[PDB]
Amino acid sequence: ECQCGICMEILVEPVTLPCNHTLCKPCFQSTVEKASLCCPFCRRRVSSWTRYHTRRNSLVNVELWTIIQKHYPRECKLRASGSALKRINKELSDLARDPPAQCSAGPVGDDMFHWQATIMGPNDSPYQGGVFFLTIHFPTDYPFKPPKVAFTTRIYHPNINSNGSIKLDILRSQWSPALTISKVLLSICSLLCDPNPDDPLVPEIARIYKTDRDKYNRISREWTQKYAMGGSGSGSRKESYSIYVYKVLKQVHPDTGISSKAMGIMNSFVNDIFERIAGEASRLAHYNKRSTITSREIQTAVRLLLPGELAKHAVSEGTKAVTKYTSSAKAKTRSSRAGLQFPVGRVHRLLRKGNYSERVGAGAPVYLAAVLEYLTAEILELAGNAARDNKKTRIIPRHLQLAIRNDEELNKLLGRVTIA
Ligand SMILES: [Zn+2]
Ligand SMILES: [Zn+2]
């Protein structure tokens, strides 16, 4: 609990500066002794203090060091043996440990430096009942530089403008590494309950808030209604498509099996293709200020990321799936309605879960599921062919690597994925 405000790892050889900020010795030497010679929290000069004590081996607060060592030895010894990414990874764990009320945030797909966040309109405030989405961008120098935070949902606030920019001291001048994204999100919640009209970002809204509060409250609720009516993230657990890879392998090679080690690689392929297409689809949606990812954003992602004929075929399979899905009967399952083996409803959840956008249309998961199915069928067809070469009836990792390397286009697509 008595943690280092920089790295969020248990204080080892804590160093307490004259300003009485404390940071573990590793953080101190890297950020104060090696270059800055200033406190990373309040920026007070500690040059004279650092040189006087480094010569006498008296940087560590012995009293503080002995207490945490006896009380919490396991974490001191675990730690004993980049910084931005790890700090961001520790933030996500902190968010899961003490989830901030009315708030949630998580990375966009597998990109840790780009998060999505939701803020429920605080209770008894004119934004109550609305869900407000925000975009968070962690800089290279995190936590030494602030995170870029902005609203993507329009809101009526004296300190929030049409760009989604948030005028809030801790986001810039008063930012400190000791702050966490959870603390930042809770400060935004307070700002919604108690605007700061005397330091406005939108003077008109501040003047109305200062001279006609009834008006301000009315317009805030109308805006909350018109525009405001985002989770842990993708998580660390690896999804699997074994059920559906098996189904496709049966269609393509009914007399050929696939080993357990090979199936894990197939999952890796499918998960990698999902992440890349959805990630690009997320970029396009944000680029064009669209709240919903649809079949259009998925297609353009496939057109750009897939090579040559794979892209053309995948685009065809995705277009035919959506077309068949729109004309199908409403009663059957979504996968059945699109004529696919891969799970449409499940792909939609994973698209929603990955924080790729505020909303996800019904055509997107159909188009993406059909693309995943097609690419899976191509890999399995070639992998099965590769196995038949070696006089084998069961696909193994070696046959998967062969099929990818022997196909120019698939090698371009999956060559970077590691096969053991
Ligand atoms: Zn530290
Ligand atoms: Zn300080």
CA of 100 from ligand 2 middle (Å) equals: 26
Number of domains in the chain: 3
Contacts of residue 305, defined as CB under 8 A and 6 or more positions apart, other chains included, come to 276, 277, 280, 311, 413
**Do 106 and 186 share a domain, yes or no?**
yes
Both 409 and 294 in a single domain?
Answer: yes
| 97-104 contact pairs (CB < 8 A, 24+) | 98/182, 100/182, 100/185, 100/186, 101/186, 102/189, 103/182, 103/185, 103/186, 103/189, 104/230, 104/231, 104/232
Both 263 and 214 in a single domain?
no
Distance 52 CA to ligand 1 centre (A): 22
Q: Which residues does 292 contact at the CB level (< 8 Å), separation at least 6?
A: 285, 357, 358, 359, 360, 361
Structure determination technique employed: X-ray
Strand order across the 148-151 sheet: 103-108, 111-120, 131-137, 148-151
How many Å is the Cα radius of gyration of the chain?
Answer: 26
Q: Using the mean position of ligand 1's atoms as its centre, give its distance from the Cα of residue 41 in Å.
A: 12
Structure token digits, residue 185:
């999100």
Q: Which residue segment(s) compose the domain that 318 sits in?
A: 242-414
For 329-338, b/e burial (b = at least 16 CB within 10 A) is eeeeebbebb
Name residues whose C-beta falls within 8 Å of residue 166's C-beta, 6 or more positions apart in sequence. 149, 150, 151, 159, 160, 188, 191, 201
Asked if the structure places residue 9 within a domain, the reply is no
For residue 10, how far is its CA from the centre of ligand 1 (angstroms)?
7
Q: Is residue 404 part of a domain?
A: yes
**Alpha carbon of 219 to ligand 1 centroid (Å):** 46
Q: What is the resolution of this structure in A?
A: 2.6
Which one of the ligands is nearest to 38 CA?
A: 2
Burial of 401 (0-12, 13-18, 19+ CB in 10 A): buried
On whether both 47 and 106 belong to a single domain, the answer is no
Secondary structure element (H or E) that encloses residue 292, with its range = strand 292-293
Instruction: Give the start-end residues of each E strand in 100-141.
Output: 103-108, 111-120, 131-137
| 5 domain residue, yes or no | no
Do residues 193 and 305 both lie within one domain?
no
Number of H helices, E strands in the chain: 17, 10
Last residue of a domain, one of 49, 81, 113: 81
Is residue 52 located within the same domain as residue 76? yes
**How far is residue 29's CA from residue 332's CA, in Å, rounded to a whole number?**
63
358: helix, coil or strand? coil
> The dihedral of CA 320, 323, 326, 332: what is its sign?
negative
Q: Tell me the sheet residues that pair with 160.
A: 157, 166
Q: Are residues 281 and 396 in the same domain?
A: yes
Cα distance between the two ends of the chain: 41
Indicate which CATH number applies to the domain containing 283: 1.10.20.10
What single-letter DSSP state applies at residue 3?
A: B
Q: Based on the fold, state whether residues 221 and 250 are members of the same structural domain.
A: no
Ligand 1 mean position to 307 CA, how many Å? 45
170 C-alpha to ligand 2 centroid (Å)? 16
Whether 114 and 48 map to the same domain: the answer is no
Structure tokens at 60: 């560590």
- Give the CATH number, domain containing residue 150: 3.10.110.10
Task: Based on the fold, state whether residues 77 and 101 are members of the same structural domain.
Answer: no
CA 36 to chain centre: 31
Q: Are residues 355 and 249 in the same domain?
A: yes
Residue 131: closest CA among 120, 123, 143, 142? 120
Under DSSP, the state recorded for 131 is E
Element (H, E) at 327: helix 308-327
> Which residue is associated with the tokens 């009942």?
129
CA 406 distance to own-chain centroid: 34
Could you write out the three-class secondary structure of 8-47? Answer: CCECCCCEECCCCCEECHHHHHHHHHHHHCECCCCCCECH
Give 106 Cα–ligand 1 centroid separation in angstroms.
Answer: 23
Centre of ligand 2 to C-alpha 48, Å, is 14
Residue keyed to tokens 């004296």: 158
CB within 8 A of 99, min separation 6: which ones? Answer: none
Same domain, 151 and 189: yes
Ligand number nearest CA of 17 is 2
Annotate 146-178 with three-state secondary structure.
Answer: CCEEEECCCCCECCECCCCEECCHHHCCCCCCC
Report if residue 218 sits inside a domain.
yes
Distance of CA 382 to the CA centre of its chain: 34
- Alpha-carbon 61 to chain mean position: 38
Q: Compute, in angstroms, the gap from residue 55 CA to the centroid of ligand 1.
A: 22
